[PDB]
Structure formats: C-alpha cells, structure tokens
Design a protein around this ligand. Structure first.
Ligand code: POV
Ligand code: R16
Ligand code: R16
Lengths: 280, 280, 280, 280, 280, 280, 280
C-alpha cells in the first residue's frame, strides 16, 4: 500500500487505496472527461463558426453583422462547453445556469415582437385570405397586394406608394377584401330642397337607374326618402354592379343625375338659415 | 487480474476489476444506450419527416412551407435525440435544456396571438351566439354571417364586401344580434317650429301610427314632446314591428309624415338665428 | 457462473452475476414496468376517449369538434404514457418535458382570455350586483338583463336588440344600476331670455313642481339661476320621484313648462348674435 | 433459498433473496404506501367535500355553483392523491406535474383580475382615503360613498343612481375628496362688454363679495381683469367658503351679480361679429 | 432473530433485521421527525398568530381584517408544516408545491399593482424631485404638495380640493416644478386690427414693459409681430419675473395694456367677416 | 486506531476510521475544493475586471460608468464564486439562487425595452426595407434617412431637423416608401360653382393635362365629376409622373389651372349660404 | 456494544452502532453545521446591517428609510440563514423557497418600472443622442437640457419651468434635436385674395428673400402657389438659415412682408362668405 505510506496516516488497517480506488478513478474520469469536453467543444465551435460564416457569406448579408453572429454562435458553444465541464468536474453550476436562463428568457421576450410576425405570415400563407393580385384593405390601408413574404406584406397603394406592412399586424384585424365578391353595391345620397315633389324625384331616379346597363336588375334597386335634414331631404339610392364597373357606374350615374335634375327643375340647396332682424 | 497488471498500479490487494466491473459495465451500457438512442432517433426522424411531408402534400399547402416544416420537425427530433444521448453519456445537459426551454417559452408567447383565436372559435362553435345566416354586429362591423371556422369568421357586409374577422377579437366584445329577437322598435325624431300646436301634432302622429298595419298595437306607442331645442322642439316617436318589416315601416311612416305635415301646415324649421343690427 | 463463462472475461474472481444480479433485475423491472405502463396507458386512453365522446354526444356539440377533442385527449394520455415509459427505461426526458411545459404555458396564456370570463361570472353569481329582471348599465350599454350564465350576460336593449356581453368585461367597470334605488332625480335646464324677470320665472316653476303629485315633497326641490350663458340664462330644476314615474314625470313637467311659459310671456331665445354693419 | 429455486437461475452462489430482500421490501412498502395514500385521499376528499358543501350551504350561494365547487375540490384532492401514488410506485410524474403547473399558472393569470381588487380593498380599508359618509370623486364619478367592501365600493351618485365600482380600479387613480378640507373656493367668470369701465366693475364686485357673510374674509378675495376675449373681457372672481355653504354661496352671489349689473348699466354681451358689406 | 421468525419467511440466511435495521431506523426517524415538525409548527403558528394580532391591535386596524390576516398567517404556517411533514414521511409533494407556487405567482402578479407604488415612493423620498411645500404639477394636476408617504402623495389643489395620488403613477410622468426655478416668464398675445401702425404698437408695449419694476431688465424683453391672422395680427410679448410676482405682473401689465391701447386709439377687433350680397 | 481512542467511544469493534475515511476525505476535498474555487474566482475577477476596464477605456465611454460596470462584473463573478463554494461545502444554496434567478428575470424584463430595438435593427439591416439615401415615412415622420445603426435610425426631416428614432418602434408599423416606386400619382380637387358647364370644364382640364410633358401618357388620366358638395361640385384629376417631377408638376398644373379658369370664366366659389329674411 | 444494550433490542448479531455510526455522525454533523450556520448568519447580519446603516448615513437619506432598509437587509440574511439551516437539518424546504421565489418574482415585476429607467439612462449616456447644453425635443416637451442622470433628465423649458423626465420614457420615442444640424428651414404661408396678380406676388416675395442676408443663397428658395383655398390662395415660402438666426429671420421677413404688401396693394382677405338674400 504505497499511497498508504506516502502521505495519509495508517491508524490501523486503514487501507485507503483498496477502498478508495473507486473514488480516485471517479476523480480521474471527471478530469479526463472535462478535458475531452473542452477540446471537442473548441473544435466544434471553430468548425461550426467557419461553416456558418461561409453559408451566410453567400446570401445577402452585411460583413459586420456576419462577424457579429458568427462570433456570437462561437461564444455560445464555448459557454455551453465551459458550463458542462464545470458541472462535470464538481462545481455547482446552478447559479450560472439560472442567470443563463434568465438571459434566455429576456432574449425570448425580446424576439417575441418578430416571432409573431413570422407565425402570422405562415398562417396567411396556409389559409390564403388573399392572393398576390388581390385588392385588399388591411387595417386602414387599401391597395393591390404585390407579394406575401415570411415577415411582411408589400402592397402598392392606389397612389403608387409601396407600403411594407408586418404580418403580425394584419392577422389581428379585419382583412377586408374587394375582389372576393364579384358584385358590389353603390350608394348615392342626393339632398334636395324641401319643396320638391317626391313623386317626380323618385320617377327621375328610377328612370336613370333603369336606363343603365351595368346595373344588375335581378337585385334590389332602392329609391326612398331616407332622412329629413337641416336644409334638405336626403334620398338614398342603392344599386348593384360588378366589382369592375363600380367606379365608372358611380361617375356616370352621378353626372346623369346632375344633368337630369337641372333639366327637370329640382334644385340642390345651399346651406339655409333663417334670420330674425331687429334694429337696436 | 489482467486489467490489474496491464496499466493500473497494484498497491496491494488492489483488485480493481473485481470491485469495479459494476462501474465499467455502467460505462458500457451508457455508450451502447447512447448508440441505440442516436440510431433510433435518426430512423424515427426520417420516417416521421417523410410521413408528415406526404400527409401534408395532400391538403392545400405551399412547397417551400412544406419543406420548411418537415425539416423543422426532423431537426427537432434530432435535437431531442442528441440531448438525450448527451445526458445518457454523462454530460450535464442542464444549460442546453435551460436555453431550450427559454426558446420554447418564446415560441409559445409568439403563438399566443393565434392560439387565442383558435380557442375563441371553439367557444363560438360550442355556445352558438349566432348561426350561419344570422345577421349580427361584431364590434362595429354589421353584416350577414357567411361561415364560422376555426380561426376566423366570414361575414358579407350590407354593401357586398366580405370581411374576414378573427375569432379571438369578437369573443372579447359585445356580440349584438338582430335576428334573435323577432320584434324590434323604431325611433323617429321630428323637430318642428316653436309656434306649432302640440295637440295637433300629437293627433297627427297618432293617426299615422294607428293607420299602419305592420305596427304592433299590443305594445307601447309613444308620441311625446321630448326636448326643447335651439330652433325646434323635438318629438320622439317609438313603435314596434317585426324584424322583417322594420326598414320599410321606417321609410313608409317617414314619407307619410312628410306628406301629412305639409298637408296640415306644420313646418319643419330651418336653423334659426336672431341678429341685432347696429350701424357703425 | 454460466453468464461469467458465456461472454465476459474472467480476470480472476470476477463473479459478475453474484455481484450484478441486482442491476440485472433493475434492468428487467425497468423494461417490464415500461411494458406495463404502455399497455395500461393504451387501454385507459381507449376507454376514456370513447367515454368522453359518449358523454359529449349527449349535450349540444359539433361532430368534428367532438372528434377533435376526443382524439386530443387520447393523444395527450398517449404522450404522457410514452414520456413516463421513456423516463422509466433510462432516457433523460428533461428536454421533452421542458418543451411540453413551454407548450402548456402557451396554452394557458391562450385560455387566459376566457378563464377570466368564467371567474367573473362566478363572482357576479355569488355577489349579485344585479338580478335577472334588473335594469342595469354595464359599461355604456343599458338595458334589462335577461340571464346571467357562466361565460356571458344577455340583456335586451331598450330598442329590442339582444346584446351578449362577456362577464370578464363587465366586472372590470362601473356596474351602474337603476332598480336598486327606488327614488331618483330628474334635472331640467330651461334657458330663457336675458330680460325675463327672475322672480316670475321662479314663481312659475315652483307652482308647476308643487302642482305635481308624483314629485316627492319631503326632499329638495331646486329652482335656481344656474348660469349666465351666451344667449340665455339657464335655470336648473331638480325634483325627486320614484324609479317608475321618472320618465312620465319628465314628459309631463316638460309639456307643462312649454305651456305655462308661453301663457305667461317668457320666451325661449333663438341663438343670438350682434352684428356691426359697415359698408365698404 | 426457495425463491432461488422457484424461478431465477442459480449461476453459482446466486443467493438473490439474501442480497435482494432490501429491494423486495422496498417494492412492498412502495405498493402498500400507494394503497394507504389512495384510501386516505379518498376518505379525506369525501369528508372535506361534504364539509365544504355544508359550510357553504349556510351563506348565500347558488345550488349548481355549490355542487360545481364542491366537486372541483373533491377532484382536486383526488388528482393530488393519484399523482402522489404514481410517484410513490415508480412512475416519473414529471410531465403530469409540469402540465399541472402550467394549468395552475393559467388559473392564476386568470384570477389576477380579481385578486387585485381584493388587495386594493384591503389597502383602502387600512389607509382610509375616505370613510362611509365621505363625498368623494373616484376617477370621474362623484357621489357620496355608501359602503366599502372587500371587492367593490358602493356610492350613491348625486342623481340617486347607485354605482358599484371595483377597488382595484380606484386605487390606481386620483382619489379626489371634498369633505376632507373644510373650506373651499368658488370661481366666477363674468364676461362684460369692451366699453365698460373697469373701476366701476371692480367696485361693484367688491361690494358684492363684501356684503356676503359666508364668504371668509381672512383669505384672498380676487377681482381682477383676467383675459381680453373675442367679444368680452373676462373678470375672474375667487372667494372662499366652507364646504357646506359653497353651492348656495355660488347661487346667491350669481343672482346678486345678475341684479346689480342690470341695475348699474353693465351689459353682458351677445356674441359679436363685424361684417363688411359689398354688393355684387 | 425474533423479527425474522415472527412474520417474514426465512428462505435461508435471510437475516433481514441485521441487514435492515438501517432502513427500519430510517422509517422510525422519519415518523418521529414528522411528529416533531407537526407539533413545533403548531405551537409556532399559535405563538406568531397571537403575537401578530397583538402587535396589530395597537396600530390603526379593522377587527375583521385583523382576524382575517392573523388566521391567514396561522394557516400559512400550518400548510408549510403539513407539506414539510408529508415530504419527510415519504409522499412526493411535488404537485402540491407546484400548485402552491402557481398560487404564489398569482398573488405576486396581484400585488404588483401596489408594490410599484411602494417602490416609487421610496425613490421619490431618496431623490427628492420635490419637497413638502413645493408647488408642483404631477401629470395634469397642479397644486401645493402637502405630504409624501410610502404609498401616495397628498397635494392641495389651488381650489382647496385635496387629491391623493399614488406614487407609482407620478414617477412615470413629467414631474414639472414651479418653485425650483426662481425666475419665470410670462407671455401675452395681443391681437390688433390690420390697419394699426406697427411702430406705435411696439413703442407702446415697450414703454409699458419698461415702466414696470418687477420685470427683470437684464434678460430678454420681446415685442415682435408674431403672426398674420384671420381678423387680427398677433403680437407676442415675453418678459421675465420672479416666481412670486408672476401672476400679479400678468394682471397689472394686462390692465395697463387695456388702458393704454384705448387711450392711444389701437382697437381690439371683433371677429370679422366679409359678405357678398346678391338678391335672388 | 488512534482517532478511535482520541475522542469517539469504542462501543466494540467500532473502528470508525477504517469505515469512515471515505467520508473524512470527502469533507477534506470539499473544503480544499472550496478554497481553490475562492482563490481562482478572486484572481479571475481581478483579471477580467481590469481587462474590461482597459478594453472599454479605448472606446467612447464615461469614467463613472466605466467604474460602475467594471465593479459590477467583478462583484458578479465574486458572487458566483461565493455561491459555488457554499454549494461545494454543504450549504443548501437553493434559496439564494432562487432569489438570484428572480433578480435576473427582473433585469431581463427591464432590458426587454432595448433588446427589442437591437433585434429590429438586425432585421432592418438584413431585409433592407430602405437604404441610406432612401426617402421614407416611418410611422408619421417622413424624411431622408441618414444612417441605420444597431439601436436607432437617423433621418433628416424636410425642414432640417434630425430625428433619432428607435428600431423596435419602426419595425412594428407601416414602412411607407417613396423612392422604391419610380412613378407616382398626383390628385387635384377643383371645386367649381354649380352653374358651370361640365363639358367646358372637362375640356379645359384635358387640354391642360395633355399640354404637359412630364405627365405620363401611357397611363390613366382622369377628369371626372366626383362629388356634389355644399357650395361646389368637385372634380377629381389624377395624373402620373416620375417620383422626381411630382411636386413641380403639381405646382405647374395648379398655376396653369388658376390661369386657364380665370381666362375662361369658370369661378371658384366662396362658401355660400342662403338666408331667409323676416323682420320682427 | 453499550448503545446496543441500552435501548434497542438485540435480535441476534444486531450490532447497530458498528453499522450505524456513519448515520449517527451524519446526524451529528447535521446539527453542528446547523448551529454554525445560525451563529455565522447572525453575526454576519449584525455586521453588514450596521455597516450599511453607516455607509448610508453619509449620503443624503431619510432616517426612517435608513432603518427600514437596514432592518430589511438584516431580516433577509436571517431568513436565508434559517432556510439553509432547515435544509441542512432535514426539513424539505421546497415549499418555503417556492413561495420565496414567488415573492422575489413579485418584487422584480414591481421594480421593472424603474430598472427600465436606469437602463435607458445608461444607454443615453453611452450613445449620446444629446449633450448638456443641447436644445432637444423629447416626446412633446422641448427645452434646453440641463443634466442627464441615472434615473431622469432635467431640462429647462423655454418658459423657465424645470421638467424632470424619466429616461425610460424618452428612449422609447423620437428624440428630435435642434442644435445637431447647423442650418434649418423656415416656412411662411401667405394667403392673399383671389384677384391678386400672381406675377407681382412672386416678384415681391423674391425681392424680399433676396434682400435678406442671413438667408442662405446656395440652397433652395421657393415661392410657389401652393393651394387654392376657401377665401384665399396660399403661397408657400421656404428659405434656409442657420440655427441661430432662424427666429429673428422669421420675424424680420414677416414684418417686411406686412409692410411690402400694404405698400404694393396686395390685400390679406377677411373670411369671405356669399349670401343669397330672399325675403319671406
Ligand atoms: C418526440 C420524442 C423525442 C424523444 C428523444 C429520444 C427518442 C429516442 C428514444 C429511444 C429509446 C430506445 C433507446 C434505448 C433506451 C436507453 C437504454 C437505457 O436507458 O439503459 C438504462 C437501463 O435500461 C436498460 O438497461 C435496459 C433497457 C433496454 C432498451 C430496449 C427496450 C426499449 C424499450 C422502449 C420503451 C418505449 C420507447 C418508445 C419509443 C417511441 C441504463 O441503466 P440505468 O442507469 O439504471 O437507467 C436509469 C433508469 N431510471 C432513470 C429509471 C433509474
Ligand atoms: C437528475 C438528472 C437531471 C438533473 C438536472 C435537471 C436540470 C433541469 C433544468 C431545467 C431548467 C429549466 C429552465 C426554464 C427557463 C424558462
Ligand atoms: C427524479 C428524476 C427526474 C429529475 C429531473 C426533472 C427535471 C424537470 C425539469 C422541468 C423543467 C421545466 C421548464 C419549464 C420552462 C417553461
């Protein structure tokens, strides 16, 4: 029992190697496994770091951002290696992994702003509330869609502007649509003076909305007195047309109204006001 | 004791195999179990990845999204396999699973935006605050419902537009309804000049709302002076009718009012203003 | 020592079965317990799945939703069985249960939108801020309550509309009430011209509010000049009445005011304006 | 060694009972402890369930809610018993308690809406920002408090309405008060014409606010030209009075102003406007 | 070996007490330690409960709230004792402490509403953005501070009202101040007619702001044409004065302006309007 | 057995060193490992603290902030060392690391406000919704971008002001753009009197928009009556031009309109009003 | 074997001390280590409490707050000591540390309101979006900065008021600046009558903006008809100047405009209105 005579006291049948080689070899495999973990983590960090820098230099990137992310991944793998080795050698790594988990939860609550956009993009792809050429209205901005991507949706406004809008923002609102339904409805409102005959007005409006051709006849065509107003009675007029003709139908019916009324004698009224004069 | 004479020092009755075969076999089963876990995880990842790609190619999908999700599931199973093998061989995997849990919590807080819509859809299906043809009002947008799905509700507005609205957004508001109650109430407001006799006005309005037929008589029929205003006294008129007749009753009573008043002599007043003239 | 001679090397007194049967039997009970867990979880999943599908087919449900939830419960029990068996056989299931807990927290943060409504319904039931027939005002919508349920409250608006409103939304606002207090107060506001005598006006208003009978006399009855205005001085009038008579008292007093003032000579004024004329 | 000869192979000095009775008895105490846990949890669930149903049937409750909560508590204790027994017998219950903790966190984030009200009620009780009869203003609603409870505060508005307002909502706003300070200040604003003498106006207003008696004299009494306006110069008037006299002081001073000005010659001006006439 | 012959089967050299007294004594110390924990927790709960009820009966409290909190603390210590004893005897208490932690997190997310106010009060005490007599403006409410406490800040409004405002609400806004800076600036705006000479106006305003004495002369004194308006050109006037004189300087300069302009001939203009007359 | 005779009682074959040297050496390696951890953590804290202070003194920093962060890192490493040593010696460090994790989660929820900006900056760099010279509109503020950094985006407003805007704020809104699309559209609105001939107006506007050269002819050119208004009928005019010419095209067409209309006879109308005169 | 004969039954070769001294000494070191932990925690709590009270009495503090925080730290260390001792003696401290972690998370979610301000202050120091004397605009409040501290930013408004604004509030908004860019742009808007010649107006404005000297000539100088309005056509005028001259340039150009136009004959128009007279 050489190690028994080298340093430790005998104290009588104290053959500590025969009953301690298990623990000694446990320490040995601990330090050797620590070495192996360190060296393997080192070489794997090098390999994966250069590999990601390569496979990122191909696609559109920035140089400083590339170096930043590559070194970030390198240091992350290095930190995992170091923590694993510390745990393997005997140090209670509970605190370092507790603060590591706190930091990870922080990063997650940070990325939450964009992971939502990614998920919403996936859902808009799989459910298809609209296609590329579809003319839509996403939360107050209306214009022909141009493309749907993973993080955002590009749509050209009717004035030529190009709006990039994030997906997570539109999936949480009313996705109105305009090319889904083929036939839609216009709504004129024609305030006239209070002395105008109602029969004549309704006759004129019915003749006008009958003479038209893009106006669908197999549906409702309303010409009713809708409201007694401050200076004028308002007539509502509702007619249906295809999604294509809508605006031109509006303009044509509107100019025909402007001509027919002035031909008949019906008068659009200026804002009226009654004054009671009294000198002082 | 061959292994005793090969490398390790004797130190006297140091028969380390006889008292260490347990730990040696523990290491052996550790590495073998690691092998088995790796190979089984590999083949299971392959099988399940091709199976999900198949069973997704049937339904409506996108090719790149299909590949993305299939490879995602493959790599997820691979990562679980790798972590399990690391833990089985002896590496403290606490840190890697801590950051994994952080990432999972991040993904959960991301999907929270749509899981809510899914749950709200389930609840609207099971409780039925409205059916398909039901004409409803969900948070400021009113129109005939068309369908109720897992993630959204489609309803055709009265103008033909088709609004897709998420479920989680309507279950958190007042779900007004219009075809639930069969009989509803109109409310006219008729401002008249300040010199008009009140008895004559109430007589006329009562005659009008008695002559009608779609007006339910077994309920309240109110014609009362409601408010002394800036240029006119306002009369409120409340009558009940079935949900179908409502709008036509409104229009008919309104035109009858417009005719009867002008027949009698009652005058709707223009906005009045009194001026005190004084030259300078 | 048969197993000693079959495969493993002797190395001298290496009787590995005599000192390893404990670990061998540990492995044996591990695999057998895994088998038992799998089979028991299978049969229990089948039984409970068919039982829940039965006990749900009775109440009002949807077929696809029934199948969805039944298969969901089946797969949940199956997953718990599989994880338990993996843990029992020797695989470190820490990562799979970490991501499982992340998913569970996600589902909880999702259901948070409706669990709140459930709890608020419980509280409104146990505390009773209003009963069925009680006429209330819950956050800007006023109308007779119809029923109080676990998830929502139905109340018929004064116009016949039926509003379904979630509980969690009303318990976080001012629950005004109207049938709790038997006696309430009206408030007229009568702007008169600037030259009218104040004594005459207050005399007239006091005579009017004394002649009435539904007006409680044992409380305050206010007729005071309240404000010098742009074209008129405003008199406030406050009187008390039972919750039933309130509106009819309002209408009757209002018409009596309109008659008495025009009988006396007091004049409600049109919006006045003084102009300084100067030709150019 | 009977059990040695019954089933297990000898393999030489393989006396597995002598060296395995510890583990056998461990299994035995495991299953027996499982039995004891199950039976004790059963009887305790029964006892506590009937006890809570009894002690809840006394106070104001609902029958279905009583049964719901009693069965809820029963099943909760049963689930805890089952999980404890599973853990005691050898099944890794990590996953079931992980999802249980997820569900518990969900329920907590749900109850968060009302636990806050409970805590705020405790704080309003212990700090006393107002008492029962105190006339307060809690976030835009002003009226005499009636009672303060654990979850809400009842206050009768000045119009007789009874508002129930949650505690957690008022502790997060400005708790204005009106009976805390005994003496408060009024503020008149008297726009007069642009040609009126300032000395005469200030003399009149000072005489008026000196003749009064409820107006505290030992404090500031302001009559200053405050603003040159569009059609009138505005005088501010600030006087102090006890919290009781405030409104009557306001009304009396206001009528005295209306009388004194018309006696003197000062003129309240109608909205003025200068027009430049030009024929076309 | 008495216990060997009493119940358990011999099976040959099965001396189970000699090799099981360790586990038997483990069970013994388990049950005895459980007893000790229960009794000690009981007596400590009694002592601490009566002690807290005593030391709370001194300060201002409510009786029912005192009993509530004392029994709450008692039951909390009792629950901790019970859980500790269960864990000590052998029951896996993981689930009960999981739901306990869920409940604790719920209570924490509840108290979050007031812990913030406590912390903000600490910070306002240690940093002193204002003192007791300091006249401040905390988020739209301006008035002399009266006291700063742990949970709220009391400040008497300029009208005598006493506002209690929570600390956590003011530390998250702009803490304007008025007695910190000794000298401040007024700003008049004097719209005059469009035909008035600019030199005369600037001369008059400069004479006025030079004649004053509380107006600091060593700083800027601005009289510039600031804006061409709808009916008048506006002159800005900026002068500096001590925080005390500010309001009286304003009133005095304003009345001096009103007198000097009317003495000179400059005319404040009524709202002008040009009309184009045309008979029909 | 010296240690057997020194202090501990014999009690018969109680050779406690021979059977306790394992535990004694466990204690020894515990205290020695604690020493090593303390000294290594000390020297590493010193080295890394001075190294970070050096490598931070180079870049732009503040002295007190440098010392603050260096001492912060030093104390952090010291605390981790202390906790590791406590765990290694035998103290249950569960509570200290629990509160440490609570503090870490607090710091993470604090930094969440800026980590989001960092991530959004990364995304704007990698996706490039705009470049340096690109003239954009980020959430209501429009102006030429100047640079894009890790935390903020600098853009010079059209008035010369320089706005620093955080990244996390713009990635959550509509990133409008103006130099992406080369050709855009103007929109004039020309209200004319009600008696003007429509044919003449449309002829004039068409001649004007044909005479121009920067107006793209291969696209739509709209001159339609768009709306009957209160005092005027409005004509819409839509023309396309390159992003460069847009504003000058607007100004030139506008002045040409102003000249051509006044040349023809078309009259822009003043706000009209009809008055009903009646003496009192 | 004395302890064998004292209390425990023999049962045959039941030498429980020889085979139980390990566990007895484990209990002994448990209780002794508990003692040591208690006494060391006591003395360390005393030392650190008096030390922090001393090192806080130096800097500006409050007495009651000092005692509060010192006793808080004392009791915190005492609680950690007690929990450590309980764990060391054998009590399962899982529940107490679970509720402790819940409380810690509560305190963290409380301090989150101010930790954010601290971090934002660090970032504003290190990035320097503005310096001390820099005149900035932070979220709607504009004025010369006075100092930047760890928790707040002090800036003197242009009227002398001193606003304390928290850092976390400004780092989340548009940090406009005014002394960063040396040269900025004014923008006049001069509505003139509809009959004024455009050539004369543009000539006059160009002469005016050429005669000036602080107006940078090497940049754009715009005088264009910008809008046809209700009663006037508006001319925009854009000129550049150094950040210093800006306001004086504005005032001087404005007065020069007012003089030159009135010299030429151009007329600023009063709000126009056309009336259609008709007697009744
Ligand atoms: C999405 C899911 C991703 C999951 C990622 C990975 C998925 C890939 C899965 C891979 C699982 C298969 C790999 C083998 C398992 C490791 C063997 C082992 O642990 O040895 C251990 C013992 O166990 C034994 O010694 C005997 C075990 C025989 C294994 C062969 C039967 C597999 C039973 C299949 C059962 C159903 C499997 C269902 C599969 C679908 C080593 O000895 P020990 O130290 O005493 O062990 C401690 C045990 N203890 C903790 C209880 C104390
Ligand atoms: C008994 C063998 C395994 C012992 C180690 C288990 C460590 C588990 C750590 C889990 C950490 C989860 C952090 C989640 C953060 C959101
Ligand atoms: C006793 C055998 C199992 C010991 C290991 C159990 C580890 C459990 C880890 C649970 C981690 C949950 C993280 C949740 C994050 C949202």
């Amino acid at each position: 029992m050489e190690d028994l005579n080298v340093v430790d006291s005998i104290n009588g049948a104290g053959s500590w190697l025969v009953a301690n080689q298990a623990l000694l070899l446990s320490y040995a495999v601990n330090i050797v496994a620590a070495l192996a973990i360190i060296i393997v983590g080192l070489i794997i960090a090098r390999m994966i770091s250069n590999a990601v820098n390569r496979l990122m230099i191909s696609r559109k990137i920035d140089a400083t951002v590339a170096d930043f992310l590559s070194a970030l991944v390198r240091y992350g793998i290095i930190a995992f290696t170091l923590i694993a080795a510390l745990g393997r050698v005997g140090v209670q790594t509970a605190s370092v992994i507790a603060v590591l988990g706190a930091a990870g939860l922080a990063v997650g609550l940070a990325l939450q702003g964009s992971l939502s956009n990614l998920a919403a993009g996936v859902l808009l792809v799989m459910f298809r509330p609209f296609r590329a050429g579809e003319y839509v209205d996403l939360g107050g901005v209306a214009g022909t869609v141009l493309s749907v991507q993973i993080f955002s949706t590009t749509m050209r406004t009717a004035d030529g502007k190009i709006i990039v809008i994030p997906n997570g923002k539109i999936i949480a609102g009313n996705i109105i649509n305009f090319s889904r339904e083929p036939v839609r409805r216009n709504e004129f409102i024609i305030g006239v003076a209070y002395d105008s005959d109602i029969d004549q007005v309704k006759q004129i409006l019915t003749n006008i909305i009958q003479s038209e051709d893009r106006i669908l006849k197999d549906r409702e065509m309303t010409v009713r007195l809708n409201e007694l107003g401050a200076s004028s009675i308002n007539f509502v007029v509702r007619v249906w047309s295809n999604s294509g003709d809508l605006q031109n139908v509006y303009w044509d019916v509107l100019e025909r109204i402007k001509r027919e009324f002035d031909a008949a004698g019906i008068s659009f009224p200026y804002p009226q006001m009654d004054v009671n004069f009294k000198r002082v």
